[PDB]
């Protein structure tokens, strides 16, 4: 696409500038172009990819939720529905764009557990975002695609990563929220959050001061959700 004529390193460099400038749509286009260069991504580059699309899709979701609430209140002219559809279609485009990158070809080229777990979590996250707005003939299939990606990531992380690994913890956090609010399995969500928190606590003693802070930062988010749900 439109980034094919820019160097890979230049795209990475500008993605970092766009992050500092809080230009996340630019950040995403740059990391999209970097991925399409066809080289595997380093740990840092993988985080730049995730952060960019998280913020882009994060604004769309928040906008979708505002409009969706207005729409439902109006159902207690066509403009409210039309504009919610517009935002929704745009949100689905970004989700399809990320899933296209993971499928072509970040996942199949990711042999390391750290990189493969990272991409499969992302895959579950963006099928979940599609699920948040799905309503029709293939909602169930979208949900199952999220479940399956999350489940493979959990199996690999369990085998290949320590219980305090921040990616394993973030994955567990998001799989738990999937269970709670997407799969209507609130008790699965609570068990997973609790078991994840406890097994990380039992492993903190092996960690350095820096890794300790990374892990506990995410253990607190698990605790926050547990506190909200019980």
């Amino acid at each position: 696409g439109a980034m094919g004529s820019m160097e890979r390193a230049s795209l990475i460099q500008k993605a970092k500038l766009a992050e500092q400038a809080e230009r996340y749509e630019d950040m995403a286009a740059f990391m999209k172009g970097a991925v399409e260069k066809g080289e595997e991504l380093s740990c840092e580059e993988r985080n730049l990819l995730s952060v960019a699309y998280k913020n882009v899709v994060g604004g769309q979701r928040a906008a979708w939720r505002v409009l969706s609430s207005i729409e439902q209140k109006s159902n207690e002219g066509p403009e409210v529905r039309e504009y919610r559809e517009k935002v929704e279609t745009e949100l689905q485009g970004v989700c399809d764009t990320v899933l296209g990158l993971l499928d072509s070809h970040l996942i199949k080229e990711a042999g390391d557990a750290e990189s493969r777990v990272f991409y499969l979590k992302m895959k579950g996250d963006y099928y979940r975002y599609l699920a948040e707005v799905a309503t029709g003939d293939d909602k169930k299939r979208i949900i199952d695609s999220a479940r399956s990606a999350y489940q493979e990531a959990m199996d690999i992380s369990k085998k290949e990563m320590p219980p305090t690994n921040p990616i394993r913890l973030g994955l567990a956090l998001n799989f738990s929220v999937f269970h709670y609010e997407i799969a209507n399995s609130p008790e699965e969500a609570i068990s997973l959050a609790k078991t994840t928190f406890d097994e990380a606590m039992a492993d903190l003693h092996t960690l350095s001061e820096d890794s300790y802070k990374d892990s506990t930062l995410i253990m607190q988010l698990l605790r926050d959700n547990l506190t909200l749900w019980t």
Partner: peptide
């Protein structure tokens, strides 16, 4: 609050 991801 809104749950966290």
């Amino acid at each position: 609050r809104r749950r966290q991801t």
